[PDB]
Amino acid sequence: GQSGSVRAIMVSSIGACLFASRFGLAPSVRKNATAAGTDLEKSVHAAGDDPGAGFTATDVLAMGAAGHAIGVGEWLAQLARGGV
Amino acid sequence: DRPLWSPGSEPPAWLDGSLAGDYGFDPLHLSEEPEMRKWMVQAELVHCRWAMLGVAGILFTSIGAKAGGNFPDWYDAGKELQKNSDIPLGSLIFTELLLFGWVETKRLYDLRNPGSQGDGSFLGITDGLKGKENGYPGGLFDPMGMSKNEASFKEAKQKEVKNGRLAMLAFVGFIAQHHATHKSPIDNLLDHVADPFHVTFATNGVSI
Amino acid sequence: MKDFTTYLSTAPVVGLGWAIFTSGLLIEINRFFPDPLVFSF
Amino acid sequence: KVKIAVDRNPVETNFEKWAKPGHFSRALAKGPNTTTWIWNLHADAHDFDNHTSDLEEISRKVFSAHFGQLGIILIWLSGMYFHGARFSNYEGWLSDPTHIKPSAQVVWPIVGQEILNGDVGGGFQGIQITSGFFQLWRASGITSELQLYSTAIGGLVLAAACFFAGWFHYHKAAPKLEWFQNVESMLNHHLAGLLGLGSLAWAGHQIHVSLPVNKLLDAGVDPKEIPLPHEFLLNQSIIADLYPSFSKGLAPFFTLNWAEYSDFLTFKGGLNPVTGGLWLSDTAHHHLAIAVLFLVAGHQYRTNWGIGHSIKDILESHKGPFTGNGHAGLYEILTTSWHAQLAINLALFGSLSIIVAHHMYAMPPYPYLATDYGTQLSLFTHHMWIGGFCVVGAGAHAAIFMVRDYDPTNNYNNLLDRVIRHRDAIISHLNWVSIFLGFHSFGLYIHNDTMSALGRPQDMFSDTAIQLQPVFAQWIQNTHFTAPQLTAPNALAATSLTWGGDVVAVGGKVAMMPIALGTSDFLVHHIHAFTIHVTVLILLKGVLFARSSRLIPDKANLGFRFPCDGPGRGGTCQVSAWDHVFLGLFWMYNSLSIVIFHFSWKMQSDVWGTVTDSGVSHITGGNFAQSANTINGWLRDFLWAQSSQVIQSYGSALSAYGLMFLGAHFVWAFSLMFLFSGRGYWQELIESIVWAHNKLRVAPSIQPRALSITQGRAVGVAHYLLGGIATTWSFFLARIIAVG
Amino acid sequence: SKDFLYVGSDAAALKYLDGTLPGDYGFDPLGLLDPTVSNGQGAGGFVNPRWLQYSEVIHARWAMLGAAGCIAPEILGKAGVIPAETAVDWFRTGVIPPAGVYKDFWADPFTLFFIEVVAIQFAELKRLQDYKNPGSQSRQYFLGLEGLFKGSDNPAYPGGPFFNFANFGKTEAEMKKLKLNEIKNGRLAMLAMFGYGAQAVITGDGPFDNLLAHLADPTGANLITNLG
Ligand code: CLA
Ligand code: CLA
Ligand code: CLA
Ligand code: CLA
Ligand code: CLA
Ligand code: CLA
Ligand SMILES: CCCCCCCCCCCCCCCC(=O)OC[C@H](COP(=O)(O)OC[C@@H](O)CO)OC(=O)CCCCCCCCCCCCCCC
Ligand SMILES: CCCCCCCCCCCCO[C@H]1O[C@H](CO)[C@@H](O[C@H]2O[C@H](CO)[C@@H](O)[C@H](O)[C@H]2O)[C@H](O)[C@H]1O
Ligand SMILES: CC1=C(C/C=C(\C)CCC[C@H](C)CCC[C@H](C)CCCC(C)C)C(=O)c2ccccc2C1=O
C-alpha cells in the first residue's frame, strides 16, 4: 500500500547487501574469507548468466537472507529507540 | 499356467496348483511344512462344509420368517428357542458334545493314520469308513457314485472349495450387517434392492 | 516356517506359555471361586 | 559433496538367525556349554563394537536401533493418551481442577484389590496419577475425550511407521559410512529443521488452538460450550472477538508493525492468577522467538553451496600457548567413534534434564500444576533421577572410548594428550577439594549435633547462634527481583516468584511463594557441592586411568570390563574403568537422594501449604530453618516425622505404597548379599548342590556355574539402586498424596 | 552440452544428466537423479532414476486432469452452458465437508468414495504389477481385455492398442517432441494446481474468480494486498 518509511531503508539494507554479494568485498560462493580480513578465490559450482563476475543464485539467497535479518532487526529496534 | 490371486505375482514353492482350490495366496507362509499343510487343508474343508450348512440354514429360516412363518432371526435364535423348550440346557450341550466327541475323534485318527478306521472295528465296516483323499472320505458319505471318476471328481472338488470360501465370507458378513442394522439378512437384501442409491453401508449411522 | 516355530521354543515356551497359563489359571480360579482359606470340609 | 549414499538390500529378512540365539558374536556361536553363556548372551546383545570392526556396519546397526527406540516411546505415549481417553476422569477434572484429583488407571477386582480403586472424586474411582498429563492436556486445548482418542490412534500409526522405517533402513535401504559422516549436514538439519521447525509449529499451535485455555476456559466457560479448535482456525470473527489483533490478518507481520500483535505475544513476568501457571501468550511469544533463533542458527556450516563454515577449520584454527596444539584431531575423534559422541551427548542430556527439573518447579508452565503438590514433587524428583543416571552414563562411555577407540597416533600434542599427560595433578587436586568440602560441609553438621547433645545450643552453626549466611545467593535473588525496573523495562515483572514478594494462590493453596535463604541453606548447598565433587572424582579418575595406570601399566590391553589383575601388588580388585562406573553409580545415588530430600523438606516447610485470611500456613510447621542444622533433625523431623502416612497406609486407598515401601526395603537388603560376598564361596556351594542332583540323576545338561565377578557387582548395584529409589518413591508419593 | 539450460544448474547434475531424458534441463540442484544413490541390487528404496521419472510423469498427468477440472465448472458457470446450480468451486463440491459439500448427487459422498476406492484400486494395483513384472498383465485372464495391457519397455509410456489407439509415435523425432510437450505441459499444470490450492486459502474463492478480480484491478487485487 504505502512505501515511504519502512520501505526506504528495507530497500537500503537489501541493496547494500547485494553490492557486497556482487562487487566483491563480501563472503560469497565466488569469494570465501578464511580469516575475515582477506577473501580467497574458489571455483564456482553452478553457472550464472551474471557478466563474468561469477555471481550465483545461492549468493543472492545468502546475502538477501542476511540483509533481511539485519534490515528487519534494524526496523523493529529503531522504532523502540524512538526514531521512525 | 494357472490364474493366481494377484495377477503378475509368483506363487510359493509349496503351492504348485495340485491342491483343491489352489490360487497361490499364502503370504504369511502358513502350511509350508507337509504336516502343517496336511492339517490346514482339512481345517479349510471342515470350515467350508460347516460354513455352507450354517449359511444355508440362516438363509432358509430368514426367508421363511420373511414369508410369514414362526421362525426367529439368525441372531438371538437360541434365546427364544430355549425358553419354550422341554430340552434342558447343559444336558443338550453335553449331549451334542458327547456325540461330536465320537465323530471328531474317528475323523482325527483318520488323519494321523490314513486309512485306519476301516478295519472292521466300528461294527464291522471294512469297504467304507476309509478316506479316498486328504479331507475327502468315502464309502458311506458318498451314496451316489460321483467320486469314481477323477475327471469329474477334480472339478467337483474345485466347486466345493470355491463355494465354501464364498459361504464363509458371507457368514462373516451376516454378523457385520446384523450388528450394524439389527435386522434379518433377507430383510437387508430386500431393502437394498428397494433403494440401491440411498441405502448402503454408508447411510446407516454405524460404520462411519 | 520351521525357523519361526523353532524360534518359538527358546524363551517364549518357558516365559510366556507357562507363565501366562499358570497366571491365568490361578487368576481365573480366584475370580470364579472367591477367596479359599480351607478345604471346605 | 553431500549426497545420499544408500546401499539397497544388504541383509535378508528371514527367521533363520532367530533359531540360533547366539549369533552376533563369534564366541557365542559354539553354543551353551556352561550357564554363563546365557548371561554372556544378554550382556553382549548391544555391544555392536564387539560384533565387528566394520564402522559402516556398526553405524547401520545403531541407526536401526534408534528407530526401534522411537517406536517404543511412541507406543508408550499412545498408551498414556488412550488411558486418559478411556480409563480416566479428564472430563470431570476439566470442570473442577481445584477439587477433583487426577486418575487415569482402573484396577480389575481379582484378589481383594478393590481398595486400590480409590475414590478420586467426580463419580469415578481409580489409581491417582502424578504424571501431570491432565495439566499438559489442559495447556494445549483438549476438551473432550475424542481428541485424546484420536491422538492415541495417530500415535499408534506413527509408531508402526517408525518400526517399519527401522526395518527398511536396515534390510532394504541401508545407508553408507560416507552418508553417516555428514556432521555439518546433520547439524544444519537438526538445528534448522528439527528444533527450529518444531518451535515454529508449536508456536502456531499455541497461537491458534491454545485459545480456550487462555481466553474461554479460564473465564469460567463450561468446556462443552467452548467452540471446537477448528472453528477458531477457520472462522476469523470468532478469534477476532477474543484477540482484536487477529482482525489485522497477517498485515502487521509483513508490514513490520509487530506492535499490533501485542495482545497475543505478551512478555508478562509472572504466573496466571486464575490457573497458577505461566501466561499462554508469553509461552507462545517464547516459542516464536526460539524458532527464529534456531532457524538463523541452522545456517552456520557449509554443506554443498560454498557459503557456511567447516567444523574441521573452526577446530584447527584454535591453538593457544598453554595447550600446545589443541583441537588437532578432535574432528577425527568425533567423526569416527560413536562412544565419544555418546559421552558428550549423554553428559549434556543429563545436565539438561536437571535444568528442566529446576525450572519446572521454579516457573510452573501448566495450568493448575502448582496447586497439585503430588505432581509437582513427582515431576521434580523424576527429572532429577533421569538426569543423574545420564551423567553417570557419560562418564562410562568416555572411558569406553579411551579404552577402545583411542589411537595414540592422531593425538600427539593436542588437548587429549596433554590431559592424559597431567592426570596425576588433576586427580590429586580433585582429591584435595573433595576432602576439604567433606570436612567443611559435614563437620558442621556433626558439630551442631555434638553442640546440641552437650547442652550448648549457643555454640552451633544456626541462625540464632553463630551463623553463615549465603550472601551471594541473597544478592542474586535481590538482583532478579529488582531487575524488571532497571535492567528489564519491557518485562512486566520478575521471571519467577521464587525471589519476589507477592504470594499467588489458586483454590486456597499456595502456588508460588517467595523463597528465603538462611544458614541451613548454606549448609545444604555445601553438602550438594561436596557430593557432586566426589562423584566427579570417581568418574574422572576412571576415565583418566582407564588406559594405563602407574600401578598396572598394561591396563589398556586388559580391556574395559575386567574383575581385576590377580592378588598381586597386595591386591588389584576393581582396577578396571567399568568398576569406577560401578563405584560412581553408588555415589550418584548418595548425591541425588540428598538433593531430592532437601527439595521435598524445603518446599513442604517454606512454600507449600494453604492460605487463609489470617496468613499462610505451610504443610509442616515451618521447621526448615530450626531443624535442618542437625543430623538428628533430619532423622527426627523428616524421615520419622514424615513417612507416618506411608506407615499408617494399610487399608486405605494408597495401601499399595506401604507394600511398595516394605518391598523396596527387601530389594535393597537383598543387594548386600550380592555386594559383599565373592564368587568362590558360591561356586563351592553350587558344587555341593550339583552332587545332590547327580545322586538322583537330575544333573542339568548345561553345567550350572556361579555368576561372573563383574556380574555379581552388576547385580548388586542394580538391586541396590532399585531398592533405594523405590523406597524414596513410595515414601514421597504416599506422604504428598495423603497430605497435599 | 549445447542447449541453454535453466537457471540453477549444477556441475555434478550436468555430469549425470544432459539431453537424454524428455524433461532434461539440467535442473536438479539437490542431487536426486545421481546414479550413486542406491548402489546395490534388488528392490531398494524410492530415490532412484527409474522410479523418480515414473513418479514425475504420473504426477504430470494427474495434475493436468486436476488443473483442467478445478476451473472448468467455474469457467462454464460464468458462461451460459452449465447450469448455475452445478457450477460450484472445486473445494466445496464434497472434497472437504467443512468448506462445503454439494447436495444433489446420485448417492452419498461416502458411497461415491467407496465406489471410487474399489475402481481406482483395481486401476492402480494393475498399474503397479506391470512396474514390478514388465508386461505381466496380459497373461492372466481379465475379461478378455488382456490385449490392451501389453505394456512397453518404459513404464511411463505403455502405449498399446488402448492407451495409444490413435497412433502418433510413427517417428522417433515426433514421438520425442510429443513427449517433451507432455512433460512441459504437465509441469505447468502442477504449478497451476499448486496455485489453485494456495489461492483458494488466501482469497477463499474459485481460481477463475481470482483472475477476474486481478484483471479489473491490478494493484488493488494482488498478492501483496490480499493478506490484509
Ligand atoms: C569442618 C568441621 C568443623 C568446623 C569448621 C568446626 C569449627 C569449630 N569448632 Mg568443632 N567439631 C567438629 C567439627 C568442626 N568444628 C566435629 C566433627 C566435632 C565432634 C568431634 C567437633 C567438636 C567440637 C567441640 C567440643 C568444640 C568445637 C568447637 C569449635 C569452634 C572453635 C574450635 C577451635 O578450636 O577453633 C579453631 C582452631 C583452629 C586451629 C582452626 C585452624 C584454622 C585453619 C588453620 C584454617 C585457617 C588457615 C587456612 C588454611 C587458610 C590458608 C591460608 C594460606 C596462606 C595457606 C569452631 C568455630 C568449640 C566451640 O566451643 O565452638 C564454639 C568446642 O568446644 N567443636
Ligand atoms: C534381605 C537380604 C537377604 C535375603 C533375602 C537373603 C536370602 C538368602 N540368603 Mg543371604 N545374605 C545376606 C542377605 C540376604 N540374604 C547378606 C547381607 C549376607 C552377607 C553378605 C548374606 C549372606 C548369605 C550367605 C553366605 C548365604 C546366604 C544364603 C541365602 C538363601 C537362604 C535360603 C533361604 O533362606 O530360602 C529362601 C529365602 C528367601 C528370602 C528367598 C527369596 C526369594 C523370594 C521367594 C522372592 C522370589 C522372587 C519372585 C518370584 C519375583 C521374581 C521376579 C523378579 C526377578 C522381577 C536366601 C535366598 C545361603 C544360601 O545360599 O542358601 C542355600 C548362603 O549360603 N546369604
Ligand atoms: C501458475 C501460474 C500463476 C498465475 C498465472 C497466477 C496468477 C495470479 N495469482 Mg497466483 N500463485 C501461484 C501461481 C500463479 N498465479 C502459485 C504457484 C502460488 C503459490 C505460492 C500462488 C499464490 C497466489 C496467491 C496467494 C495469490 C495469487 C494471486 C494471483 C492473481 C494476482 C497476481 C498476484 O497477486 O501476484 C501473484 C502471486 C504469486 C505468489 C505468484 C507467484 C508465483 C510464481 C509464478 C512462482 C513463485 C515461486 C514458488 C513460491 C516456488 C516454486 C519454484 C521453486 C522451485 C523455487 C493472478 C491472476 C492473488 C489473487 O488471488 O488475486 C486476487 C493472491 O493473493 N497467487
Ligand atoms: C529437517 C529434516 C530433518 C528432521 C526433521 C530430522 C529429524 C530427526 N532426525 Mg535427522 N537427519 C537429517 C534431517 C532431519 N532429521 C539429515 C539431512 C540427515 C543426514 C545428515 C540426518 C541424519 C540423522 C541421523 C543419523 C539421526 C537422525 C535422527 C533424527 C531424529 C532425532 C530424534 C529426537 O531426538 O527427537 C525427535 C523426535 C521426533 C520429532 C518425532 C518425529 C518422528 C517423525 C516420523 C520424523 C520424521 C522426520 C523425517 C526426517 C522426515 C523425512 C523422512 C521422510 C522420507 C519420511 C529426528 C526425528 C536420529 C534418529 O535416527 O532417530 C530415529 C539419528 O540417529 N537424523
Ligand atoms: C507456523 C504455524 C502456523 C500455521 C500453520 C498458521 C496458519 C494460519 N494462520 Mg497463522 N501465525 C503464526 C503461525 C501459523 N499460522 C504465527 C507464528 C503468527 C504470529 C504470532 C501468526 C499470526 C497469524 C495471523 C494474524 C493470522 C494468521 C492466520 C492463519 C490462517 C490463514 C493464513 C493464510 O491464509 O496464509 C496463506 C495460506 C496458504 C498460502 C495456503 C497454503 C497452500 C496450500 C496448503 C497448498 C495445497 C495445494 C495442493 C498443491 C493442492 C490441494 C490438494 C487438493 C487437490 C486435495 C492459517 C490457517 C489468519 C487467520 O487468523 O485465519 C483466520 C490471520 O489473520 N496467523
Ligand atoms: C557413612 C559411611 C561413609 C563415610 C563416612 C565415608 C567417607 C568418605 N568416603 Mg566413602 N563410601 C561409602 C561410605 C562412606 N564413606 C560407601 C558405602 C561406598 C561404596 C559406594 C563408598 C565409596 C567411596 C569412594 C569410591 C570414595 C569414597 C571417598 C570418601 C572420603 C571422601 C572425603 C571427603 O571428601 O569428605 C570428608 C570425609 C569425612 C567427613 C570423614 C568423616 C570425618 C569426621 C568429620 C570425623 C572428624 C575427625 C574427628 C573429630 C577425629 C576423631 C578423633 C579420634 C581419633 C579420637 C571420605 C572420608 C572418596 C575418597 O577416597 O576421598 C577422596 C572416594 O573416592 N567413598
Ligand atoms: C565457578 C567455576 C569454578 C570456580 C573455580 C575454578 C578454578 C578451579 C580449576 C582451575 C584450574 C586451572 C588450570 C587451568 C588450565 C589452563 O590454564 O588452560 C589454558 C587456558 C589458556 O589456554 P589457551 O589460551 O592456550 O587455549 C586456547 C585454545 O586451547 C582454545 O581451545 O587458561 C585458562 O584456562 C584460563 C582460565 C583459568 C581458570 C578459570 C576457571 C574456569 C572455570 C569457569 C570460569 C570461571 C570464571 C569465574 C566464575 C566465577
Ligand atoms: C489417525 C488420525 C485420527 C483418526 C481418528 C481415530 C478414531 C476417532 C474416533 C474414535 C473415538 C470413539 O468414538 C466413540 O467414543 C466417543 C467418546 O466421547 C463418543 O463420541 C461422542 O462424544 C463426543 C464428545 O464430544 C462427541 O463429540 C460425539 O459427537 C459423540 O459421538 C462416542 O461414544 C463414539 O463416537
Ligand atoms: C548369590 C550369589 C551368587 C549365586 C547366584 C545365582 C545362583 C544366580 C541365581 C539366578 C536365578 C536362578 C535366576 C532365577 C531367579 C528365580 C528362579 C526367579 C523365581 C521365579 C519363580 C516364580 C519360579 C553368585 O554367583 C555371586 C557371584 C558374585 C558375587 C555375588 C554372588 C552372589 O551373591
What is the C-alpha to C-alpha distance for residues D621 and D638, in angstroms, rounded to an integer? 12
**In sequence order, what are the residues at sequence separation of 6 or more whose Cβ sits closer than 8 angstroms to the Cβ of residue D590?**
D531
D76 is in an annotated binding site: yes
Residues 2-21 of B with CB under 8 A from E: 3-4, 6-9
What is the rounded CA–CA span in Å between residue E76 and residue E87? 7
- Please list every residue in chain E whose beta carbon sits closer than 8 Å to the beta carbon of residue D7: 38-40
Q: Residues of B with CB below 8 A from E138's CB?
A: none
- Residue B145 burial by CB count (10 A; 0-12/13-18/19+): exposed, middle or buried? exposed
Q: Is residue B208 within 8 angstroms of chain E, CB to CB?
A: yes
Whether chain D has a CB inside 8 Å of the CB on E52: the answer is no
Q: Domain limits of chain D?
A: 1-740
Name the residue at shortest CA distance from atom 42 of ligand 6.
D439
Pick the ligand that lies closest to the CA of residue D428: 6
Rg (CA), chain A: 15
Asked if the D1-740 domain carries CATH number 1.20.1130.10, the reply is: yes
- Host H or E run for residue D175: strand D173-175
> What is the three-class DSSP state of A41?
strand
- Comparing CB atoms, the residue among A56, A69, A79 nearest residue D296 is A69
Note the ligand closest to the C-alpha atom of D436.
6
Q: Is the CB of D208 under 6 A from ligand 9?
A: no
Looking from the CA of residue D441, the nearest atom of ligand 1 is 1
Cα(D367)–Cα(D507) distance, integer angstroms: 12
B151, containing H or E segment: helix B150-181
Ligand having the closest approach to the CA of D188: 4
D306–A76 C-beta distance less than 8 A: no
Q: Which of D208, D290, D294 to mutate to test the pocket of ligand 5 (most atoms within 8 A of CB)?
A: D208
Q: For chains A and C, tell me whether 3 or more CB atom pairs sit within 8 A of each other.
A: no
Task: Kindly tell me the sign of the dihedral angle through the C-alpha atoms of E189, E190, E193, E195.
Answer: negative
The total of other beta-carbon atoms located within 10 Å of residue D41's CB is 17
- With cell 557486497, the residue in question is A20
How far CA E39 is from CA of B184, D10, E42, in Å, comes to 60, 11, 10
| DSSP collapsed to 3 states, B128-146 | CCCCCCCCCCCCCCCCCCC
Count of CB atoms situated within 10 Å of the CB of E99:
16
Q: How many domains does chain C have?
A: 1
Residues with CB under 6 A from ligand 7: D 318, 320-323, 326-327
Q: Which residues pair with D509 in a beta bridge?
A: D506, D610
Alpha helices in B182-202 (DSSP H): 185-194
Among the bound ligands, the one closest to the CA of D163: 4
Question: Which chain C residue lies closest to D14 (C-alpha atoms)?
Answer: C3
Rounded distance between C-alpha atoms, residue D606 and residue C28, angstroms: 51
Q: What nine digits make up the cell of D356?
A: 528442566
Classify D273 in phi/psi space as left (phi over 0), alpha (psi -120 to 50) or beta: alpha
Q: How far, in Å, CA of D359 to CA of D563, rounded?
A: 42
In DSSP notation, D478-504 reads HHHHSHHHHS-SSSSS-S-SSSSS--E
Chain C residues touching residue D111 (CB < 8 angstroms):
30, 35
- B205 vs E contacts (CB less than 8 Å): none
D190 belongs to an annotated ligand binding site: yes
Q: Phi then psi for D609, rounded to 5 degrees?
A: 150, -140
C31 labeled part of a ligand binding site: yes
Distance from CA of B56 to the nearest CA of E (A): 29
Asked if D25 and E64 count as a contact pair (C-beta separation under 8 A), the reply is no
Structure solved via:
cryo-EM
Task: Say if residues D104 and D124 touch (Cβ distance below 8 Å).
Answer: no
For residue D308, the CA-to-ligand 7 centroid distance in Å is 30
CB D576 within 8 A of CB D583: no
Residues with CB under 6 A from ligand 3: E 191-192, 194-195, 198-199, 202-203, 210-211, 213-214, 221-223, 226
- Cβ-Cβ pairs closer than 8 A, A with E, add up to 14
As beta bridge partners, residue D344 has none
- State the distance from the centre of ligand 6 to the C-alpha of D729, rounded, in angstroms: 27
d(CA B114, CA B140): 16
Distance CA E130, CA E126 (A): 7
Question: D677-700 in b/e burial notation, b at 16+ Cβ within 10 A?
Answer: eeeeeeeeeeeeeeeeeeeeeeee
Q: Which domain holds residue C15?
A: 1-41
* CB-based pocket (< 6 A), ligand 4: D 63, 66-67, 70, 182, 185-186, 189, 193-194
CB of A81 within 8 Å of any CB in chain D?
no
CATH T-level topology, domain E11-225: Chlorophyll a-b binding protein (1.10.3460)
Q: What is the resolution of this structure in A?
A: 2.8
Q: Look up residue D26 and give its three cell numbers.
A: 563369534
Q: How many Cβ atoms are within 10 Å of D74's Cβ, its own excluded?
A: 20
* Chain D residues near residue E45 by CB distance under 8 angstroms: 6, 8, 168, 172-173
Any CB–CB contact under 8 A between A59 and chain D?
Answer: yes
Helix H, strand E, coil C: the string for chain E is CCCCCCCCCCHHHHHHCCCCCCCCCCCCCCCCCCCCCCCCCCCCCCCCHHHHHHHHHHHHHHHHHHHHHCCHHHHHHHCCCCCCCCCCCCCCCCCCCCCCCCCCCCCCHHHHHHHHHHHHHHHHHHHHHHHHCCCCCCCCCCCCCHHHCCCCCCCCCCCCCCCCCCCCCCCHHHHHHHHHHHHHHHHHHHHHHHHHHHHHHHCCCCHHHHHHHHHHCCCCCCHHHHCC
Classified as helix, coil or strand, D547 is coil
Give residue for cell 492415541. Answer: D152
D15 touches E: beta carbon within 8 Å: no
Instruction: Tell me the chain A residues in contact with residue E8 when contact means C-beta distances shorter than 8 Å.
Output: 46, 57
User: How many A from CA of D353 to the centre of ligand 6?
Assistant: 29
Could you tell me if E37 and E15 are in contact, meaning their C-beta atoms sit under 8 angstroms apart?
no
Q: Is beta strand D6-8 parallel, antiparallel or unpaired with respect to D173-175?
A: antiparallel
Radius of gyration in angstroms for the set of CA atoms belonging to chain E, rounded to a whole number: 22
Which grid coordinates are listed for D409?
597416533
Find the helix or strand (DSSP H, E) in which D330 lies.
helix D330-336
Q: Which chains neighbour E (Cβ–Cβ under 8 Å, 3 or more pairs)? A: A, B, D
Give D611's strand partners.
Answer: D616
Q: Which of D141, D622, D535, D619 is nearest to D347 (CA)?
A: D535
CB contact under 8 A, D18 and C35: no
Nearest CA in chain C to B32: C1
Candidates D427, D429, D439: which one to mutate for ligand 6, based on the most atoms within 8 Å of Cβ? D439
Are A and E neighbours with ≥3 CB pairs closer than 8 A?
A: yes
Q: Any long-range contacts for D602-606 (C-beta under 8 Å, 24+ apart)?
A: D602/D515, D602/D521, D603/D361, D603/D373, D603/D376, D603/D377, D604/D642, D606/D513, D606/D515, D606/D516
Choose which residue among D574, D587, D671 to substitute to test ligand 6 binding: the one with the highest number of ligand atoms within 8 A of its C-beta. Answer: D587
Q: Which of E135, E180, E158 is nearest to E54 (CA)?
A: E158
Taking CA A37 as the corner, what is the angle to CA A34 and CA A38, rounded to the nearest 5 degrees? 65
**Cell numbers placing E64:** 493436468
User: What Rg value do the Cα atoms of chain D yield, rounded?
Assistant: 29
Angle between helices B150-181 and B34-67 (to 10 degrees): 60
Does D5 contact E at CB distance below 8 Å? Answer: yes
Question: Closest approach of chain D CAs to the CA of E154, in angstroms?
Answer: 22
Tally of helices (H runs) and strands (E runs) in chain D: 29, 6
**What residues contact residue A69 under an 8 Å CB cut-off, 6+ apart?**
D296
